[PDB]
């Protein structure tokens, strides 16, 4: 064992640099003679090189000395004042520029992100701390996952370490130098394989430690529980419990929770449900129509008269005088950055603005720009007139006297010299100044004097917060006209436009609208994203009026004025056939549009939740039975007036619909009620305060622990037995249920279970009853470890009976927004989710060996349906249910107790055994968690406390924090047992809830002579019953009643609670909100257009197309006629249009019809788009892939066209195309058409060039843990630090738009705008637009040579034309290279708006093809990008051929979940389009 130190020491002889650095440690170890030491001397060594590497490759200076920073600073004669402990492994200084470079090495992926999170946080801290000194820093953190390094190279670095592991445990086995711990530590280390290998066995690898808390634990879950019994001996007990039952029940101990529908009585309890306000019952439409155009001051702004222009003065407000241009310009220059803008070059902006505005006044007698006294500034500002003469004559005065000169003079110097400037900086670019329309001639040469003789006269814009006297006349426009949804489009713009303006009469910042003829300002006083004061004024009348919105919450409403009110109009043309409804038919309609209006003119939590609790009226309404708490949980605090006009409104509606003497179609009145209680979803998703939902999320989190007595505060990490006891305590209590055989008798809603109903469970899951037939078939050396890089201290060695040696699981709780209420959400570290995911997975696989679930299958789903479909046809009665309070209900005591308890059937004893004891282990871990408590939360009550402390309604838990705030205590943890992970422990709950249902069905079915079918996912259940109960329920009211009381007290007695909403009925079912009917189906028209209206986000304009696409696309498959998804789609493309983006034939096509999206795809759409272009071309092309293709089937030639056509030319080579065969070629002037592709180069900036699917694959490759550690969460904490809304996307989308967003042919960065004029110059190309607008190119071909910069960003249309249709006609039927033709023959008919159709589309790939096809055409790339890390595929080569070398869309050719079934209207198939394949 002493060759190896030979050759080891002449191979790191030979093979490093020399650096004067390494030098030294080379030496050192080169004379060293002891094996101890030569470990030392080579760990140091090789942790020298590693951090040296590291400081030399990121542009560093290295801590060799190692001083700390204040060492660094003073000896740089940076004084600092005193600090904490920090040592800088990298430190440089430039400038005012300092880098610090700590770096590690970890192997482990927990290890890692917790040194990653651990030295973040550090450096975060000291750099808040030095940011004092005014110098910036910026931390650079590098952690690798190899020793791999530059100094020296691979395989002398691995027999190194390998030989320093054999003389490790040689030494260790020898000397024992070293102890078990840190010995072992140092293995874990070095050995770069033990990492992560193992699975569930690496429990295997700590110790056990479990001493007396387990027994204890174990024993109580197993105190009472019989699961021995047999089949005979559980009838009996259940004949026993129901007779007792019914007859306490009969005599009037037990309550029961059920009534008898009654139609009149619920409509009667509705109407009287707010009775301390609305002192009435009926209301006149007329009053209520009157008064709603007069309730706020938005309402009253909307239906007003204003009708300012005679038909000539508004002529002038589409001139565009050089007031507007001026502007602009200055706008544009201020966009860059001047020096020395304070005082001076601003005020030269106001004047060029202000004689602009004289020269544009006295030529033609213009007024804008202007309001009482005052004009619009550069910055959207409001700046006066008197104080700006001030201060140019103070300014020209001292000037003038600082130095014969004239006013006039100085004044066009000025002027002159600062014009010089911008322009030249302007030209310096990539724009001239010509393209702007301004010119040189509101300077004239007397300006000064005109200045100071001007005048104005008018009124004062002024702002009031809070009798109204309209200027105006309230109300005289017609609900039936589209005149207030174009105003509140318009206003609504305006407000969020209002956002834009940055930070710096005291100041007042203005923006302008007009909706038909003079314009109105918006006026506000204050900038940023927060609710503020606006004022609307105008120049003849100011303060029209004023109110106290929000910004961040108006977008629904922009560009969409000609969709909703198609959306009303469709939604009106269901109940129109109603043979006792005609006579009232615009009540309808008014009421319907007063509610749209209204719901989007003030949006409000409140009116969320009343428009929310709709459906389930609607559903109780139309039922047998339902429970008795059910009105009163449809009644929620309101406070404004407008809530309680709404309120009537939605009365008043629902007693003309649901009155009496109606019996013609119940099922369209159902769907029409149900969609209008769907319009809840188009106020928004986000919430309107933060604080308060974070205050009402922990009280839901903390109420229901504080009567079941159990709270733990502040638990240390060694629980003492003070809260062991307690806790073995409580768990006996949770097991003491009592019911029906006692004196108190049952009660409701406490958490527990009883012993004698999991004994019945578990015996008769043991002995066998619940399956089907195809079921039963299946020490200075630590402190020298402690230098090193690579040497870890954060592995567990041996877990307890709560949890590892570490600690306990800790874990953070944080809200979910969502429509209605808000969802609690639990987050945990890295290696607690690796921990949980056994838990997860093991019983997801039980539960899959079972058959019945819902929650992640996708088999049992279309079974569901279809039994809900065969049910509802036959009449039966269904049973639909929801629990409520699932998550803090449930308990892992429960889960451990049911588990401890089954026995199962040769399932590898042994192993059996031992993965019992592991998931024991792992129950008893979860049970001991801890949850942190936020800190806003605390930092208020504490506020709150000394506030109204020294100087009523007192909520629980703010007498909690009273209590324990004043014996000197503060909140930071709190420990339960009674509280189950919300959202964590998932798939467990699921398997309980199965058998528990299975074991109740059979109980029910034992009783009585009936079978039940069930169906459930965790937290919803669709129960059906067969003939005999059907029969049964109409025969006799009595025994239904008690069959159905007596389930839900057992559903009690398991620990399952029936919420109030749960329904029993034969006229409609329901499952994860999907609802079926007999004779009709039910889409939710509002709830798909909502969802489609506000989906849009900051990202490159190529993917939204995609995005909406695709929601389009899955909304179609219900029921949503054509025009709508039209309609938003040409809404999408003004939206696009407004941010000043060139629109090309690759974002959308707004003229589909049924056949497009039921047979074709994406691609297909686009085919069409550009056929309705340009056609008398496009079929020549067609002939000739025809042709092609029907030669290429047979696989003729598949090479000819791989390599020699494809990767050539495009144009010649598609000549050659058409003299390969018989056809007539194109004409010279068809490959004129080109389209323009700005991302010709690199894709576009928001904050070589390879295909993209080089940057997918390299990207779902290069991220497993090694190639993919650094950047993944990197990214994540950087996107951390983030939180934006929708609105604020679409304004930071407006404004990077305009901004560079353009790289240029090498590395370069232009404008939009320059690319234009550059391409405008040339006056041989010809631009041409559509209807909707498309822009597209003829270029000639002579032109193209001369300028060869700016004509490399055109690109040919038949190429990409060609390249799409082929791909497309291999991915589907050979039916596409047809030739296309509408059907005009067929005759019109009357058709109802109620009539659909069901349709089938026409109808693996994997990884490793694409990867082998790309090596075995394209070896170039392949050695180079993808080495570093017989009929299907013969297409395959050519789709990958086709992607790679046309690279427009064609990318979505293989990047494509995809729904099947389409339902769709019979009255629309009939005008489709005809595609024959001869
Ligand atoms: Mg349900
Ligand atoms: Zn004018």
Same mark, same amino acid.
């Given at each position: 064992?002493?060759?190896?130190?030979?050759?080891?020491?002449?191979?790191?002889?030979? $093979?490093?640099?020399?650096?004067?650095?390494?030098?030294?440690?080379?030496?050192?170890?080169?004379?060293?003679?002891?094996?101890?030491?030569?470990?030392?001397?080579?760990?140091?060594?090789?942790?020298?090189?590693?951090?040296?590497?590291?400081?030399?490759?990121?542009?560093?200076?290295?801590?060799?000395?190692?001083?700390?920073?204040?060492?660094?600073?003073?000896?740089? *004669?940076?004084?600092?004042?005193?600090?904490?402990?920090?040592?800088?492994?990298?430190?440089?200084?430039?400038?005012?520029?300092?880098?610090?470079?700590?770096?590690?090495?970890?192997?482990?992926?927990?290890?890692?992100?917790?040194? $990653?999170?651990?030295?973040?946080?550090?450096?975060?801290?000291?750099?808040?701390?030095?940011?004092? =000194?005014?110098?910036?820093?910026?931390?650079?953190?590098?952690?690798?996952?190899?020793?791999?390094?530059?100094?020296?190279? #691979?395989?002398?670095?691995?027999?190194?370490?390998?030989?320093?592991?054999?003389?490790?445990?040689?030494?260790?086995?020898? %000397?024992?130098?070293?102890?078990?711990?840190?010995?072992?530590?140092?293995?874990?280390?070095?050995?770069?394989?033990?990492?992560?290998?193992?699975?569930?066995?690496?429990?295997? =690898?700590?110790?056990?430690?479990?001493?007396?808390?387990?027994?204890?634990?174990?024993?109580?879950?197993?105190?009472?529980?019989?699961?021995?019994?047999?089949?005979?001996? =559980?009838?009996?007990?259940?004949?026993?419990?129901?007779?007792?039952?019914?007859?306490? @029940?009969?005599?009037?101990?037990?309550?029961?929770?059920?009534?008898?529908?009654?139609?009149?009585?619920?409509?009667?309890?509705?109407?009287?449900?707010?009775?301390?306000?609305?002192?009435?019952?009926?209301?006149?439409?007329?009053?209520?129509?009157?008064?709603?155009?007069?309730?706020?001051?938005?309402?009253?702004?909307?239906?007003?008269?204003?009708?300012?222009?005679?038909?000539?003065?508004?002529?002038?407000?589409?001139?565009?005088?050089?007031?507007?241009?001026?502007?602009?310009?200055?706008?544009?220059?201020?966009?860059?950055?001047?020096?020395?803008?304070?005082?001076?070059?601003?005020?030269?902006?106001?004047?060029?603005?202000?004689?602009?505005?004289?020269?544009?006044?006295?030529?033609?007698?213009?007024?804008? *720009?202007?309001?009482?006294?005052?004009?619009?500034?550069?910055?959207?500002?409001?700046?006066?007139?008197?104080?700006?003469?001030?201060?140019?004559?103070?300014?020209?005065?001292?000037?003038?006297?600082?130095?014969?000169?004239?006013?006039?003079?100085?004044?066009?110097?000025?002027?002159?010299?600062?014009?010089?400037?911008?322009?030249?900086? /302007?030209?310096?670019?990539?724009?001239?100044?010509?393209?702007?329309?301004?010119?040189?001639?509101?300077?004239?040469?007397?300006?000064?004097?005109?200045?100071?003789?001007?005048?104005?006269?008018?009124?004062?814009?002024?702002?009031?917060?809070?009798?109204?006297?309209?200027?105006?006349?309230?109300?005289?426009?017609?609900?039936?006209?589209?005149?207030?949804?174009?105003?509140?489009?318009?206003?609504?713009?305006?407000?969020?436009?209002?956002?834009?303006?940055?930070?710096?009469?005291?100041?007042?910042?203005?923006?302008?609208?007009?909706?038909?003829?003079?314009?109105?300002?918006?006026?506000?006083?204050?900038?940023?994203?927060?609710?503020?004061?606006?004022?609307?004024?105008?120049?003849?009348?100011?303060?029209?009026?004023?109110?106290?919105?929000?910004?961040?919450?108006?977008?629904?409403?922009?560009?969409?004025?000609?969709?909703?009110?198609?959306?009303?109009?469709?939604?009106?043309?269901?109940?129109?056939?109603?043979?006792? /409804?005609?006579?009232?038919?615009?009540?309808?309609?008014?009421?319907?549009?007063?509610?749209?209006?209204?719901?989007?003119?003030? &949006?409000?939590?409140?009116?969320?939740?009343?428009?929310?609790?709709?459906?389930?009226?609607?559903?109780? $309404?139309?039922?047998?039975?339902?429970?008795?708490?059910?009105?009163?949980?449809?009644?929620?605090?309101?406070?404004?007036?407008?809530?309680?006009?709404?309120?009537?409104?939605?009365?008043?509606?629902?007693?003309?619909?649901?009155?009496?003497?109606?019996?013609?179609?119940?099922?369209?009145?159902?769907?029409?009620?149900?969609?209008?209680?769907?319009?809840?979803?188009?106020?928004?998703?986000?919430?309107?305060?933060?604080?308060?939902?974070?205050?009402?999320?922990?009280?839901?989190?903390?109420?229901?622990?504080?009567?079941? *007595?159990?709270?733990?505060?502040?638990?240390?990490?060694?629980?003492?037995?003070?809260? @062991?006891?307690?806790?073995?305590?409580?768990?006996?209590?949770?097991?003491?249920?009592?019911?029906?055989?006692?004196?108190?008798?049952?009660?409701?809603?406490?958490?527990?279970?009883?012993?004698?109903?999991?004994?019945?469970?578990?015996?008769?899951?043991?002995?066998?009853?619940?399956?089907?037939?195809?079921?039963?078939?299946?020490?200075?050396?630590?402190?020298?470890?402690?230098?090193?890089?690579?040497?870890?201290?954060?592995?567990?060695?041996?877990?307890?009976?709560?949890?590892?040696?570490?600690?306990? /699981?800790?874990?953070?709780?944080?809200?979910?927004?969502?429509?209605? *209420?808000?969802?609690?959400?639990?987050?945990?570290?890295?290696?607690?989710?690796?921990?949980?995911?056994?838990?997860? #997975?093991?019983?997801?696989?039980?539960?899959?060996?079972?058959?019945?679930?819902?929650?992640?299958?996708?088999?049992?789903?279309?079974?569901?349906?279809?039994?809900?479909?065969?049910?509802?046809?036959?009449?039966?009665?269904?049973?639909?249910?929801?629990?409520?309070?699932?998550?803090?209900?449930?308990?892992?005591?429960?889960?451990?107790?049911?588990?401890?308890?089954?026995?199962?059937?040769?399932?590898?004893?042994?192993?059996?055994?031992?993965?019992?004891?592991?998931?024991?282990?792992?129950?008893?871990?979860?049970?001991?968690?801890?949850?942190?408590? &936020?800190?806003?939360?605390?930092?208020?009550?504490?506020?709150?406390?000394?506030?109204?402390?020294?100087?009523?309604?007192?909520?629980?838990?703010?007498?909690?924090?009273?209590?324990?705030?004043?014996?000197?205590?503060?909140?930071?943890?709190?420990?339960?047992?009674?509280?189950?992970?919300?959202?964590?422990?998932?798939?467990?709950?699921?398997?309980?809830?199965?058998?528990?249902?299975?074991?109740?069905?059979?109980?029910?079915?034992?009783?009585?002579?009936?079978?039940?079918?069930?169906?459930?996912?965790?937290?919803?259940?669709?129960? @059906?019953?067969?003939?005999?109960?059907?029969?049964?329920?109409?025969?006799?009211?009595?025994?239904?009643?008690?069959?159905?009381?007596?389930?839900? $007290?057992?559903?009690?007695?398991?620990?399952?609670?029936?919420?109030?909403?749960?329904?029993?009925?034969?006229?409609?079912?329901?499952?994860?909100?999907?609802?079926?009917?007999?004779?009709?189906?039910?889409?939710?028209?509002?709830?798909?257009?909502?969802?489609?209206?506000?989906?849009?986000?900051?990202?490159?304009?190529?993917?939204?197309?995609?995005?909406?696409?695709?929601?389009?696309?899955?909304?179609?498959?219900?029921?949503?006629?054509?025009?709508?998804?039209?309609?938003?789609?040409?809404?999408?493309?003004?939206?696009?249009?407004?941010?000043?983006?060139?629109?090309?034939?690759?974002?959308?096509?707004?003229?589909?019809? =049924?056949?497009?999206?039921?047979?074709?795809?994406?691609?297909?759409?686009?085919?069409?788009?550009?056929?309705?272009?340009?056609?008398?071309?496009?079929?020549?092309?067609?002939?000739?892939?025809?042709?092609?293709?029907?030669?290429?089937?047979?696989?003729?030639?598949?090479?000819?066209?791989?390599? %020699?056509?494809?990767?050539?030319?495009?144009?010649?080579?598609?000549?050659?195309?058409?003299?390969?065969?018989?056809?007539?070629?194109?004409?010279?002037?068809?490959?004129?058409?080109?389209?323009?592709?700005?991302?010709?180069?690199?894709?576009?900036?928001?904050?070589?060039?390879?295909?993209?699917?080089?940057?997918?694959?390299? %990207?779902?490759?290069?991220?497993?843990?090694?190639?993919?550690?650094?950047?993944?969460?990197?990214?994540?904490?950087?996107?951390?630090?983030?939180?934006?809304?929708?609105?604020?996307?679409?304004?930071?989308?407006?404004?990077?738009?305009?901004?560079?967003?353009?790289?240029?042919?090498?590395?370069?960065?232009?404008?939009?705008?320059?690319?234009?004029?550059?391409?405008?110059?040339?006056?041989?190309?010809?631009?041409?637009?559509?209807?909707?607008?498309?822009?597209?190119?003829?270029?000639?071909?002579?032109?193209?040579?001369?300028?060869?910069?700016?004509?490399?960003?055109?690109?040919?249309?038949?190429?990409?034309?060609?390249?799409?249709?082929?791909?497309?006609?291999?991915?589907?039927?050979?039916?596409?290279?047809?030739?296309?033709?509408?059907?005009?023959?067929?005759?019109?008919?009357?058709?109802?708006?109620?009539?659909?159709?069901?349709?089938?589309?026409?109808?693996?790939?994997?990884?490793?093809?694409?990867?082998?096809?790309?090596?075995?055409?394209?070896?170039?790339?392949?050695?180079?990008?993808?080495?570093?890390?017989? &009929?299907?595929?013969?297409?395959?080569?050519?789709?990958?051929?086709?992607?790679?070398?046309?690279?427009?869309?064609?990318?979505?050719?293989?990047?494509?979940?995809?729904?099947?079934?389409?339902?769709?209207?019979?009255?629309?198939?009939?005008?489709?389009?005809?595609?024959?394949?001869?």
């Amino acid at each position: 064992m002493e060759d190896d130190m030979a050759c080891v020491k002449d191979l790191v002889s030979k $093979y490093l640099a020399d650096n004067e650095r390494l030098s030294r440690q080379k030496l050192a170890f080169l004379v060293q003679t002891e094996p101890r030491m030569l470990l030392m001397e080579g760990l140091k060594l090789l942790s020298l090189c590693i951090e040296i590497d590291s400081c030399n490759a990121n542009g560093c200076e290295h801590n060799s000395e190692d001083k700390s920073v204040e060492r660094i600073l003073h000896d740089h *004669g940076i004084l600092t004042p005193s600090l904490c402990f920090v040592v800088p492994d990298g430190y440089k200084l430039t400038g005012n520029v300092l880098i610090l470079l700590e770096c590690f090495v970890r192997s482990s992926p927990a290890n890692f992100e917790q040194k $990653y999170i651990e030295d973040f946080k550090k450096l975060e801290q000291l750099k808040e701390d030095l940011k004092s =000194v005014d110098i910036n820093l910026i931390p650079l953190i590098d952690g690798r996952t190899s020793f791999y390094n530059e100094q020296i190279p #691979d395989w002398v670095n691995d027999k190194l370490r390998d030989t320093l592991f054999s003389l490790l445990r040689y030494a260790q086995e020898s %000397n024992s130098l070293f102890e078990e711990s840190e010995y072992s530590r140092l293995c874990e280390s070095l050995s770069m394989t033990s990492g992560r290998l193992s699975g569930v066995e690496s429990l295997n =690898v700590l110790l056990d430690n479990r001493s007396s808390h387990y027994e204890e634990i174990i024993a109580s879950c197993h105190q009472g529980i019989n699961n021995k019994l047999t089949a005979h001996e =559980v009838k009996l007990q259940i004949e026993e419990e129901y007779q007792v039952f019914r007859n306490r @029940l009969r005599k009037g101990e037990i309550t029961g929770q059920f009534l008898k529908v009654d139609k009149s009585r619920l409509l009667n309890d509705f109407n009287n449900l707010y009775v301390d306000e609305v002192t009435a019952t009926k209301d006149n439409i007329e009053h209520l129509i009157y008064q709603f155009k007069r309730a706020s001051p938005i309402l009253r702004f909307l239906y007003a008269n204003i009708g300012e222009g005679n038909g000539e003065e508004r002529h002038h407000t589409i001139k565009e005088c050089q007031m507007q241009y001026w502007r602009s310009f200055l706008n544009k220059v201020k966009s860059l950055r001047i020096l020395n803008t304070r005082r001076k070059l601003l005020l030269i902006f106001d004047a060029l603005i202000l004689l602009a505005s004289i020269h544009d006044q006295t030529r033609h007698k213009c007024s804008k *720009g202007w309001l009482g006294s005052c004009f619009i500034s550069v910055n959207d500002r409001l700046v006066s007139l008197e104080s700006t003469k001030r201060d140019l004559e103070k300014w020209v005065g001292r000037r003038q006297q600082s130095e014969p000169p004239d006013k006039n003079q100085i004044l066009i110097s000025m002027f002159q010299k600062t014009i010089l400037k911008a322009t030249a900086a /302007l030209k310096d670019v990539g724009i001239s100044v010509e393209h702007y329309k301004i010119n040189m001639e509101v300077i004239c040469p007397d300006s000064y004097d005109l200045i100071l003789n001007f005048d104005v006269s008018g009124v004062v814009p002024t702002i009031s917060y809070q009798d109204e006297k309209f200027p105006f006349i309230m109300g005289g426009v017609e609900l039936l006209e589209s005149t207030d949804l174009e105003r509140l489009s318009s206003l609504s713009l305006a407000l969020v436009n209002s956002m834009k303006t940055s930070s710096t009469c005291k100041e007042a910042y203005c923006q302008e609208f007009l909706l038909s003829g003079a314009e109105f300002q918006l006026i506000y006083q204050k900038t940023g994203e927060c609710s503020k004061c606006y004022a609307i004024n105008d120049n003849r009348v100011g303060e029209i009026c004023s109110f106290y919105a929000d910004p961040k919450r108006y977008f629904p409403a922009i560009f969409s004025a000609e969709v909703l009110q198609t959306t009303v109009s469709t939604m009106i043309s269901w109940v129109k056939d109603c043979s006792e /409804l005609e006579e009232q038919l615009c009540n309808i309609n008014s009421l319907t549009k007063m509610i749209l209006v209204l719901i989007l003119a003030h &949006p409000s939590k409140r009116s969320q939740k009343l428009l929310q609790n709709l459906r389930y009226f609607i559903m109780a $309404y139309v039922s047998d039975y339902h429970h008795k708490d059910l009105i009163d949980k449809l009644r929620e605090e309101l406070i404004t007036d407008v809530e309680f006009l709404l309120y009537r409104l939605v009365r008043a509606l629902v007693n003309l619909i649901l009155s009496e003497d109606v019996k013609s179609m119940m099922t369209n009145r159902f769907k029409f009620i149900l969609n209008i209680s769907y319009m809840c979803h188009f106020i928004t998703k986000e919430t309107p305060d933060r604080l308060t939902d974070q205050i009402k999320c922990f009280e839901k989190f903390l109420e229901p622990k504080l009567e079941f *007595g159990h709270v733990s505060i502040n638990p240390a990490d060694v629980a003492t037995e003070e809260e @062991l006891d307690d806790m073995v305590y409580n768990a006996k209590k949770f097991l003491s249920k009592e019911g029906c055989t006692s004196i108190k008798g049952p009660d409701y809603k406490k958490p527990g279970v009883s012993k004698r109903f999991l004994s019945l469970l578990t015996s008769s899951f043991n002995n066998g009853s619940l399956f089907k037939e195809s079921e039963v078939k299946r020490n200075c050396t630590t402190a020298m470890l402690k230098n090193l890089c690579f040497y870890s201290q954060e592995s567990p060695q041996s877990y307890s009976s709560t949890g590892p040696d570490t600690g306990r /699981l800790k874990f953070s709780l944080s809200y979910k927004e969502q429509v209605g *209420g808000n969802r609690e959400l639990y987050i945990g570290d890295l290696r607690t989710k690796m921990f949980t995911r056994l838990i997860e #997975d093991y019983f997801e696989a039980l539960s899959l060996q079972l058959s019945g679930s819902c929650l992640n299958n996708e088999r049992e789903f279309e079974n569901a349906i279809l039994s809900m479909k065969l049910n509802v046809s036959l009449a039966h009665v269904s049973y639909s249910m929801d629990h409520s309070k699932w998550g803090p209900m449930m308990c892992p005591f429960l889960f451990l107790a049911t588990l401890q308890n089954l026995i199962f059937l040769s399932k590898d004893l042994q192993a059996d055994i031992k993965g019992r004891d592991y998931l024991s282990t792992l129950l008893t871990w979860h049970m001991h968690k801890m949850v942190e408590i &936020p800190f806003n939360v605390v930092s208020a009550m504490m506020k709150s406390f000394i506030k109204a402390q020294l100087g009523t309604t007192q909520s629980i838990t703010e007498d909690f924090f009273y209590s324990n705030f004043q014996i000197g205590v503060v909140p930071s943890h709190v420990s339960s047992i009674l509280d189950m992970g919300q959202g964590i422990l998932h798939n467990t709950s699921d398997f309980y809830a199965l058998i528990s249902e299975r074991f109740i069905n059979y109980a029910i079915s034992c009783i009585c002579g009936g079978t039940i079918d069930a169906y459930t996912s965790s937290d919803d259940q669709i129960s @059906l019953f067969d003939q005999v109960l059907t029969e049964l329920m109409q025969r006799d009211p009595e025994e239904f009643k008690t069959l159905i009381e007596f389930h839900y $007290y057992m559903s009690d007695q398991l620990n399952k609670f029936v919420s109030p909403k749960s329904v029993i009925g034969r006229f409609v079912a329901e499952f994860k909100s999907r609802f079926y009917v007999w004779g009709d189906e039910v889409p939710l028209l509002t709830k798909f257009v909502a969802a489609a209206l506000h989906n849009i986000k900051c990202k490159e304009p190529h993917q939204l197309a995609e995005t909406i696409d695709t929601i389009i696309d899955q909304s179609v498959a219900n029921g949503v006629p054509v025009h709508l998804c039209n309609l938003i789609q040409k809404r999408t493309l003004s939206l696009l249009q407004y941010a000043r983006y060139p629109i090309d034939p690759f974002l959308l096509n707004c003229e589909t019809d =049924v056949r497009d999206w039921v047979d074709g795809n994406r691609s297909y759409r686009i085919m069409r788009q550009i056929e309705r272009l340009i056609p008398d071309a496009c079929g020549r092309i067609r002939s000739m892939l025809r042709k092609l293709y029907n030669k290429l089937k047979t696989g003729q030639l598949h090479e000819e066209f791989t390599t %020699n056509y494809l990767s050539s030319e495009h144009l010649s080579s598609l000549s050659n195309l058409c003299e390969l065969l018989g056809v007539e070629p194109p004409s010279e002037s068809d490959l004129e058409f080109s389209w323009l592709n700005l991302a010709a180069h690199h894709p576009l900036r928001m904050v070589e060039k390879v295909p993209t699917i080089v940057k997918t694959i390299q %990207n779902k490759l290069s991220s497993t843990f090694t190639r993919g550690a650094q950047k993944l969460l990197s990214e994540a904490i950087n996107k951390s630090a983030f939180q934006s809304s929708i609105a604020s996307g679409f304004v930071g989308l407006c404004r990077t738009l305009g901004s560079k967003c353009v790289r240029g042919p090498n590395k370069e960065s232009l404008y939009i705008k320059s690319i234009q004029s550059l391409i405008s110059d040339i006056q041989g190309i010809e631009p041409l637009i559509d209807s909707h607008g498309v822009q597209y190119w003829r270029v000639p071909l002579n032109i193209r040579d001369g300028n060869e910069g700016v004509i490399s960003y055109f690109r040919p249309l038949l190429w990409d034309y060609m390249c799409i249709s082929l791909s497309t006609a291999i991915e589907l039927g050979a039916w596409v290279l047809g030739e296309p033709k509408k059907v005009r023959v067929l005759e019109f008919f009357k058709h109802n708006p109620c009539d659909y159709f069901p349709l089938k589309p026409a109808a693996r790939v994997g990884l490793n093809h694409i990867i082998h096809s790309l090596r075995r055409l394209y070896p170039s790339v392949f050695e180079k990008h993808i080495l570093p890390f017989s &009929p299907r595929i013969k297409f395959l080569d050519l789709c990958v051929a086709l992607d790679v070398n046309c690279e427009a869309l064609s990318l979505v050719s293989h990047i494509v979940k995809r729904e099947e079934h389409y339902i769709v209207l019979s009255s629309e198939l009939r005008l489709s389009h005809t595609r024959t394949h001869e």
